[PDB]
Amino acid sequence: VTNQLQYLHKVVMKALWKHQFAWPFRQPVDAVKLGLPDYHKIIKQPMDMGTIKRRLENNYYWAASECMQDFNTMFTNCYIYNKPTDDIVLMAQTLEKIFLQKVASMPQ
Amino acid sequence: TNQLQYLHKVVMKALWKHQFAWPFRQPVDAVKLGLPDYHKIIKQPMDMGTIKRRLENNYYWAASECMQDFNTMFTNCYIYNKPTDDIVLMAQTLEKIFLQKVASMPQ
Ligand SMILES: O=c1nc(Nc2cccc(Cl)c2)oc2cc(Cl)oc(=O)c12
Incomplete structure (x- = not known):
């Protein structure tokens, strides 16, 4: 398994x-x-x-970018499907911000 | 910074x-x-x-702050527009490139 x-x-x-x-x-x-x-x-x-x-x-997964695209699809599905005011959008935004914060420090 | x-x-x-x-x-x-x-x-x-x-x-003080702004830009598009709007496809396409390139950023 790669470092990433x-x-x-x-x-x-x-x-x-x-x-x-x-x-x-x-x-x-x-x-x-x-x-x-x-x-x-x-x-x-x-x-x-x-x-x-x-x-x-x-x-x-063969590459890390592939896994990252799956996380991205999960969050994007939520933003697309739900009403802007739904609490679930807030929850997704909170998780995605952690996702991105962590990805900023990923190897390679 | 390098990032x-x-x-x-x-x-x-x-x-x-x-x-x-x-x-x-x-x-x-x-x-x-x-x-x-x-x-x-x-x-x-x-x-x-x-x-x-x-x-x-x-x-920016850190790479992550910049990445969060990219994310806000794409997320705004998904939240505001109808699912069937072409701009959603355009944002998806750009965001996939963003994540591909971010994966190769210096750690
Ligand atoms: O992505 C979603 N995931 C879930 N999970 C979920 C919801 C209730 C109970 C349990 Cl056990 C799991 O619920 C959603 C509800 C709505 Cl309205 O939109 C969504 O996009 C999602």
Whole structure:
């Protein structure tokens, strides 16, 4: 495992997974459970932290940028789908700011 | 810093000349663009012209602060526009380049 992917796993995912605002993002969006019948009409590439974490655990990624794009898709899906005023947007913004702060110190 | 230099000369330069970058090179002009609700929804406007000027004038203390402004710029687009708007695709395309280039920044 590259230095970069080790960092994404040990530093970035570690910080984000345990965060108090992480829970809406720890599993795929369940549109039935959440009452969101248009979710998959709007969001064509669902992504969540559970998936990213499993991919890090299973050496799915070849480059760190690939993992970073998955985090990015997760956050962007939230901004695109939700109303600007929804609390979930605030939660995503908070997590993404940590993501970027940590990525500023990633190797290589 | 070494990182701020990189964000200016490597990251911003690449984004700036991109064929999808023209809506992002200057602040959103809500009057000229006919967006009467833009500043009621978007409370922290950001654009690449502003970031570039901040880079030129040594406004940033750290690389992360600059990266946060890029992020705010893209996030504003996703929040304000309709999912089906072309500008969302343009922002997505630019943001993927941003993250690719950031992955190679000096640690
Ligand atoms: O991305 C999202 N993730 C979640 N997770 C979630 C939500 C409630 C319970 C549990 Cl266990 C998980 O909920 C959402 C609700 C809405 Cl409205 O928009 C969203 O984009 C998301």
